[PDB]
């Protein structure tokens, strides 16, 4: 559950590859943004 604000984890359409999407910065990623 521990996660930074603004980010959100979702699942792809046909695939299930969790990723990091920021609704604020509108940026995307995959690796846990621990920085």
From Swiss-Prot:
Superkingdom per UniProt: Eukaryota
Location in or out of the cell: Nucleus; Nucleus speckle; Cytoplasm
Expressed in which tissues: Expressed in immune cells in the lung (at protein level).
WW domain ranges (all copies): 2-35
Function: Peptidyl-prolyl cis/trans isomerase (PPIase) that binds to and isomerizes specific phosphorylated Ser/Thr-Pro (pSer/Thr-Pro) motifs. By inducing conformational changes in a subset of phosphorylated proteins, acts as a molecular switch in multiple cellular processes. Displays a preference for acidic residues located N-terminally to the proline bond to be isomerized. Regulates mitosis presumably by interacting with NIMA and attenuating its mitosis-promoting activity. Down-regulates kinase activity of BTK.
Complex and partners: Interacts with STIL. Interacts with KIF20B. Interacts with NEK6. Interacts (via WW domain) with PRKX. Interacts with BTK. Interacts (via PpiC domain) with DAPK1. Interacts with the phosphorylated form of RAF1. Interacts (via WW domain) with ATCAY; upon NGF stimulation. Interacts with PML (isoform PML-4). Interacts with BCL6. Interacts with FBXW7, disrupting FBXW7 dimerization and promoting FBXW7 autoubiquitination and degradation. Directly interacts with RBBP8/CtIP; this interaction depends upon RBBP8 phosphorylation.
Protein name as it appears in the record: Peptidyl-prolyl cis-trans isomerase NIMA-interacting 1
Organism: Homo sapiens
Lineage: Eukaryota, Metazoa, Chordata, Craniata, Vertebrata
Underlying gene: PIN1
Range covered out of full length: 6 to 39 of 163
């Amino acid at each position: 559950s521990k996660l930074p604000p603004g980010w959100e984890k979702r699942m792809s359409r046909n695939s299930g590859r969790v990723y990091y999407f920021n609704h604020i910065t509108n940026a995307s990623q995959f690796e846990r943004p621990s920085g």
